[PDB]
C-alpha cells in the first residue's frame, strides 16, 4: 500500500502529455508564452526556472512536448485554452530517428527487458525527458504501484561528460530546470529503482 504522495506521483506520470509541432508564438513575456497550435487551440505555458526561459518572439515556430497543470477551458468566444508548463523547443529535426539507450536496474538487478525511447527532434527540454523516462518506469517496471518501488534516480551523461539527474521519490523540480539539450550528444541514460 503506498502513501498519498506516491499516489499523486503515479497520477502525474500516468496522465499523458501534449505533443504539438510547429505551433506559433503569439506573445512571450517574462516566463509566460501564448502559443497558437495547428488545431486552433491556444496554450498558456509558464517557465518558472531562472535557467530556462525560451527566447522565441512573435511569429516564430516552436515545438511543444509538455504537460497540463490544470484542466483546459473555453473562452466565451469558444476558443479552447490549455495551461501547460515548460516543454518548448525549436523545430529542428534529425536526418533519421534515434533510439536513446535507456539502461534500467531494479533493486540492484539489470532489467533484461529493454525499452529504447525514439525521437526525431534535435533538442528536448529536460522536463520532457524526465516524463518519458518515468512514464516507462511506472508502466513497465511498476514504479509507484507498490511500497517497494518508490525511489531511486535517473541519470543522463553527455558526450562532454556533463550530467543531469533527478530523484525518483519527488516530483521533477521545474523551478530549477536547466536549458534543453541536444539528444544526439547523450552518451547514456540510466535509471535505478530502489
UniProtKB/Swiss-Prot annotation:
The keyword Disulfide bond does not apply. One of its GO terms (molecular function) is toxin activity. It comes from the Bacteria. Keywords: Secreted, Signal, Superantigen, Toxin, Virulence. GO terms for cellular component: extracellular region. It is found in: Secreted. The keyword Secreted applies. Responsible for the symptoms of toxic shock syndrome. Belongs to the staphylococcal/streptococcal toxin family. This is Toxic shock syndrome toxin-1. The chain holds residues 41 to 234 of 234 of the full protein.
Amino acid at each position: 500500500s503506498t502513501n498519498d504522495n506516491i499516489k499523486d506521483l503515479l497520477d502525474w506520470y500516468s496522465s499523458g502529455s501534449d505533443t504539438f509541432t510547429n505551433s506559433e508564438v503569439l506573445d512571450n513575456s517574462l516566463g509566460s508564452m501564448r502559443i497558437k497550435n495547428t488545431d486552433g487551440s491556444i496554450s498558456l505555458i509558464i517557465f518558472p526556472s531562472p535557467y530556462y526561459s525560451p527566447a522565441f518572439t512573435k511569429g516564430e515556430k516552436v515545438d511543444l512536448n509538455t504537460k497540463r497543470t490544470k484542466k483546459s477551458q473555453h473562452t466565451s468566444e469558444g476558443t479552447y485554452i490549455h495551461f501547460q508548463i515548460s516543454g518548448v523547443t525549436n523545430t529542428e529535426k534529425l536526418p533519421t530517428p534515434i533510439e536513446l539507450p535507456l539502461k534500467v536496474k531494479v533493486h540492484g538487478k539489470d532489467s533484461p527487458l529493454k525499452y529504447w525511447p525514439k525521437f526525431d527532434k534535435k533538442q528536448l527540454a529536460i522536463s520532457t525527458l524526465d516524463f518519458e523516462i518515468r512514464h516507462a518506469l511506472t508502466q513497465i517496471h511498476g514504479l509507484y504501484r507498490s511500497s517497494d518501488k518508490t525511489g531511486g534516480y535517473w541519470k543522463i551523461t553527455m558526450n562532454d561528460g556533463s550530467t543531469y539527474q533527478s530523484d525518483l521519490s519527488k516530483k521533477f523540480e521545474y523551478n530549477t530546470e536547466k536549458p534543453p539539450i541536444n539528444i544526439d550528444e547523450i552518451k547514456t541514460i540510466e535509471a535505478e529503482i530502489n
